[model samples]
Target chain A: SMTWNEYDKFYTGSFQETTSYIKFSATVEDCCGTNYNMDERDETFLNEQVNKGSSDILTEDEFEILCSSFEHAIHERQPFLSMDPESILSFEELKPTLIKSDMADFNLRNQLNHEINSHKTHFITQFDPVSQMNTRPLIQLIEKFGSKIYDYWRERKIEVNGYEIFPQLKFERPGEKEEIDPYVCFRRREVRHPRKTRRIDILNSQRLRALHQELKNAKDLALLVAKRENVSLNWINDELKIFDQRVKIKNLKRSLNISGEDDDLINHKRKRP
Target chain B: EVARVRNLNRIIMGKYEIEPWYFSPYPIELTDEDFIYIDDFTLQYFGSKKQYERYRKKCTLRHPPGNEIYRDDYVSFFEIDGRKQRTWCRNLCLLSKLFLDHKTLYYDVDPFLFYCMTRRDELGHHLVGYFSKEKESADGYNVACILTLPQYQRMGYGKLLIEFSYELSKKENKVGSPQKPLSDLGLLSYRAYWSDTLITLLVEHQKEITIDEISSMTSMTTTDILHTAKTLNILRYYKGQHIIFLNEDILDRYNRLKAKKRRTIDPNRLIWKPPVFT
Candidate 1:
């Protein structure tokens, strides 16, 4: 127990700044632990704990906890001095350096989004229904490097060559010492060929193997183009009507049994749309 | 140490809130960086587009550097006071200093404006909301300044800064009315601050204004202007609306003047003017 003199000081000081009131949760039940302190007779035990736990508090989170506690105390009419009203900082006054970085990042993303969207007009891919995209290439790229390059890729449908990565990624997140096998599922998209037209061949709605006879007479020009180019012919024909471009590609790849890793832009590049 | 109190954005006092960067150039997209003279505060909720648009239009006039609208700029920095940096116990202490100095710089601030301003670790994230103060305008309390920043805006120090100013205003008011001897300094200080930061943009036809015009005028995208005017200010709807401003005097008699000499005036136009003094 703290002496009357010591307790008075602790209580008084704690009341002055609401942030000073820190509640200790743990108490020693048994002395089986090596570092356990059985000295209830030690006069400065609580004081030592206070100094050790809060002396070097520097992070904003720590200050936030303290300030919140203090604010709450003031609210409860704890007789603390009212906080000075002019203590607020404007955004510009917050951090000039960070603000600069913030603008740079914002413009860079905006420019990249515009460029990526523009580039899409030239490519034969569609980027709607974000969930079904053939994002394996993007996922792998993010993994190989880190995620600092572009954050709005999915929103803007940005596509860079799998091998040609963004410069910012070079210094981005590398796996931590303790992290292992971070990724769960690689891009598992399903794409439908634009040229594939649904026919009434009884097997049209059946499994691929069931359509062996129908395959002999399949007449999708987009598929024919894919077959001629040694690409997966499971792609739909010129009528590309899938709701999601990514999903269509995923489905096409799955139907054709084409591994996405093998289809990475690094491995091959399609000449035509 | 004295902080850099010059070249700041205008401090806007709304009916229920105050915006430190109300006249900032960033809102109009004139500058590539976020305005530093302002705090990130929302009138009702943080990320409330309505409040931002309202605050932007009321304070900023489309005068020069083109019609840029506010956006999240990740580049550019602010003018700060280096000497005061030392008194700060933590980084957030600097924010508190900024808020206090701003209040000292502006007029009688409402106490409700002061909210939490504790700095965050990385990206400043929080949902800003108004807290009913023991003070209200109807009950004789109003917001001194409401600084609402983007959610992703780093460290929500703006909220704290505005609240601080509001409280300061309240304290001053209690000492004496704002028109009193000591409190008169509030209006003078605020006017000086407003002169430095108050800005305006001249909205023009988006297509007619080329990249050169944008660069020369320091204009922002058309999206920003319409948002502030229509959504924020609730003044005019600018969604994809094309505008061409003309200030010309028509001949006394339009019937006698040539067609080209007559100024174009819409017959359906309804004008609302503030009551004029005798």
Candidate 2:
């Protein structure tokens, strides 16, 4: 049996080729409201697009057009293929998930998880009806995603255009009302001061000489109080874990365990009593 | 020779004689005294008996030196900018250090904004608890360090401060988490708030909801929400999808907390705007 790292070591076309393939495929899937398939036809087509052996490569222009449409579909929370003339799209969270080796895939999977699982989603939409028709947070998203994707493309050896990615990095006037769009700013910035609080050793020494003298409480009492406090903290954490465990077991006991039951019946029972 | 450790074990601040934890270099004379007395309203550290005498006779400020941003029956919140109230802010870190095991901050307090939650009687609005957040938290932290004075532990003010942190995050349109390495005591308080908040949402949200939906509604990070879900054991894998199942116990916990009338925050009562930092 081949170890996973061995595949990475042996892939003919560089390991990044696969990573970018997965990353880009996942993104396109989310944007397209479709899931990435493992079929040979899908892989070859993806490789063809990424491999670029094309007369005309994927232009940044056409991609931006797709993005223009994507921003509307997702921002309006609508789908590309109409569920209705007016449909708001919502996505399911990445499931049942773990730790990353690349320190990569685990957490981001959920952030990127816009699965086929969505409802016709009502009421919450109507209540929050202020549609964003304007600054187009999408262009910011384009610039932000452009930097990453373009970099990914160059590394994976896909030939794509300059995309003229909009500059979403702000001057940061530190405060504002026109919301800091994540698509615009993307990843957060760093703190101003690096490490200021690491001087406890010096303080601990100082506490020792002057500290042991506050003679009111006995040493036995001090140790006992500290011992009880430690026990109390343990119980606190234990009780929390216990509360969670019992609740989950109860929930599981109440829930249906079959995969072939009526989907409607499964859901109807899941509703809060 | 300059001293590196603070020798004082407890502080006598007006009515409350409280113990401090950790070592922050607050200025004091070399008397080997175990307790330091401080003026409550002004947050003035008293060096001697004469100091309190002078402060009590001459001090004029009856409340924290800042604009009150939130108010209701039991408490009001004062928004104090560290840069604006340098002395008060430093004094707060010194006082808060008694209860805070984590080295939250002591120096360079200017980057933060503190919201002091206080209860009022005739003379002044005494501090119950408060939380500080950076005016420009580069990491998008909603609260850097929080404390509800030792005098105010189980009155639910800790949850109040946590909710208010999310309340501000809701206004800022950012997903917020507390700056981490939360002390054991702090971990307990915040998890309680998370369980309380997430469980209620699970019970009240009227339809099938996604994890992302809960994150956006509460301005909490998706990872944090997932942890809360994992803790509550509401999500189960079955029928080829992750399903949220709520048990009677979970419902009862939600009602149990709800029926227990405690101090709460009213978003309507919050009469302030997010501060703009230049």
Candidate 3:
């Protein structure tokens, strides 16, 4: 006797292939009567069933039904146990007592029972024990599916872009293509440009531009002095005394018409006493 | 320090915040002037039909920024639904993964996709940046997978995109926050906005304020307001309640920081009307 794992392997793999063959043959026999031959109608019905049942495998219950239907042909002939011949047992009476007694039934039953138990074990192992107790259906779903469960409502969003939510303007969903067509989709659609704000307008003015320029000039001058003196530029600018001296020198240079000879004297006297 | 901030972009969010992936540094140059905050581009779909028509008319209320002859710079904001525009989203998946981390790609785009654009001359309206928002969020996640293209980093556009999202939440008469866990740069930008919003609130009240007051005034979620308050070190736990009292020192420090980071929100610029979502 093979183990349950061995049967599950056989059931999903090789057993799948044989189930359909047996079902078709059984149907064919039923249609052709006891002659065990196929007519045109029988062949046509078999063809239609095969196509329709492509994805469907033989379930355990269906297997029993099929086996029961084929009982008459099986019992009347060879390798038969006519044990109840004294009672004039037809295949119908013979089936109930004998079919469950078949090796096929035993194997199929074992495979199904084992499959269910295995799946239950896997689920038990994977279940979140923490949120499992005393939680609402919503919390249970959240634990099972994370935050994405909230997106289910968004799936119910109306198609008319922004219109369903707000009816004034037409809202269009963006076209779903890799190559975005500008004019054909939401890409080129005209939207009202937000009016310029007061602060934004102020920042755009000449005053801000001049202020930026002045700050830049001061930073550059401070960097130059820092580089020459080998001191931190931040420190150089941080000292009011040093920064005041530089400003005073700039003003002196602009206002004075000193000769080259007196430049050293002015430079010497530039620092505050 | 600049490299450090840029490197922070390399470290994306993991499940517990220490999660990171190696990212090749890709730089994009964008300045303040290139951004045109298209106020009218934000289409209102949540409120009344009259408000919608008014917004629709406001869309045509285009005035060029001081005679700059709004060139056919085909900049358009595309409204995309995740399920409907599945293909366009799949196409953007790689780029999104590259700039953002791995987990962002896993989110359902069933939310709204606001693709803000700029005219790329003859090529078309170049997608500068986009932010995804869930339509119905109990946690008030107004934005997620928020990204400005690699070529457009350091421009105030990221701030603009974030501000626009809050603007939507405000119009909806609801407080909102970005979905977590945010990337490093995402956190920095949020902190800046939160600080700015809190300071604005504190300045207005000039006294003690409750979490609910800040939440209502700014349309900020209570969770976010409390988080911001905690970050600012201003919240006091008194007998099972959170109270925020702004002292002279804290107020002065905020004012100094506010001056340094001059990113302030002007409510008048937002033109979208609130939708009537019950």
Candidate 4:
């Protein structure tokens, strides 16, 4: 038991046999304003805490127990004065030599989101959703090996032929470390919109499958004619590309549309698309 | 932070008993209490019932404090300049701040134009949803921000609000994109709208359509067009050419469902021109 003189330092109210006292749910702030600074316990410190935990005069033992209990309870709180508004940092704060690698990566994603490459078409797939997306590790991959994966989808690279892009990426949860598929993530959407809306579908939908087949039939007929008479299906009149002649194809430039409009042009040379 | 200043759990405006989703700064008279009462027409918020009653008794506002630009059926778009109708726009933003995590409040509202979409009834035009657009976008963006009130969501107000932005863009003969880094809700609705319009144009068109053609037709950038095309998996590589293949899934559904009366914008009903800046 703290002696009357020692316990009195933390508290001042009299200790007599009385019924009223502060409840256990009271926080340090309720009994006293929180100690924002690590102020030393002195007369002013006790003066600052000279309120709350109200009780009529109670026994010294009872008062000592409650004081010790609450003294143990209200030690001190976390000092947050070294606050951070600008203490936060973006990805740009990095080593210069290392900065270039992220430059390609950052610009690879940044080109899509930022206006640096103004004239060029940019892709903004990952920029849309903020909180609920479980795709942070892949975002890190974009940071680490950005340009390495820049033309990756254009080259049609898959992870172990599983048709998934970030196969090796796994994010940790408290209970489970879940591996997410990029293609699946692309297909899976958080919010469902109006019925007329079409996103990348998980099932790839029946009508798309059928149209794909019909599109296949059309492609075969076009391939037959183009590979034959060589008059060429100037896809200009066609709904796809504006192909009048292969005039631009004569150049050493292998310029394909960002959406792969001329995916066939490269395929003709290398047995690829 | 919100409850300390606003001291309110929710707000009851006309038919909506809306629980604020985030903190918004308003004058102390309106927010420093247990609840805020608002006159829906004037959108004057009050700290108590007596103030609300006093404001409601003599004030005679029926519709929004802006010029009506687009009207279809009973639905109309009231174009409010942020600089001109500052209080109304601030009221709108503060009301939406409870539901939206990111929005400007307490800041001046002079840089944007608010297209207030409302529905007219006996009580006059009640707000359904609205999209604000920057008066001039250096990045070629049209929509600054948009929201459908919780009371009026899922009734195609968002869809119509979006379509109206494009319709206005179509009138201007310019492409429209929204503010960058759109939140999840805005992103999906946009992707939905872009895919809907783009794929429909693809399937319905009979001949020789280039990306630029679709760009000119829709006032949408080719990048957005291609993104939507690829997302729907309608753009394909067959033989030696990248071709737009129709996704029968969406097209057939579009064909099947389009016969039913769905909410879409009627540009013919619009009676305004883009504000020319000097």
Query: What are the per-residue Cα lDDT tens digits for candidate 1 across B1-278?
Result: 11333223322212213233212111122122222222221111112222233223222111111111111222111111212221111212222322333332111122222222222112221223211122333423333323333332334333233223333333333210121122243344433322211112222231333323432332222333333333222233145544422122211222233332412212122121211222
Comparison by lDDT, 1 against 3, better one: 3
RMSD of 3: 36.0
DockQ, all models:
0.01, 0.01, 0.01, 0.01
lDDT of 2 at A265: 30
True contacts recovered per prediction: 0.00, 0.00, 0.00, 0.00
lDDT (Cα, tens digit) per residue for candidate 3, span A139-202: 2222332222113212212222211111121123455544322112212324478788998798
Error of 3 at B162 (Å): 2.0
Positional deviation of residue A226's Cα in model 3 after best superposition, in angstroms:
70
Best by lDDT: 2
User: Which residue pairs show collisions in model 4?
Assistant: A16-A57, A16-A58, A207-B248, A207-B249, A208-B249, A264-B240, A264-B241, B21-B98
Model 4 chain A is weakest, by summed lDDT over 10 consecutive residues, at A30-39
Query: Which of the two candidates, 1 or 2, achieves a greater TM-score against the reference?
Result: 2
Tell me how far the alpha carbon of residue B129 in candidate 2 is from the true structure, in angstroms, after superposition: 1.3
- Misplaced by over 4 Å in model 2 are A1-273, B1-6, B28-31, B104-106, B237-243
CA shift of A251, model 4, Å: 99
- Report the Cα RMSD per candidate: 29.0, 32.2, 36.0, 32.0
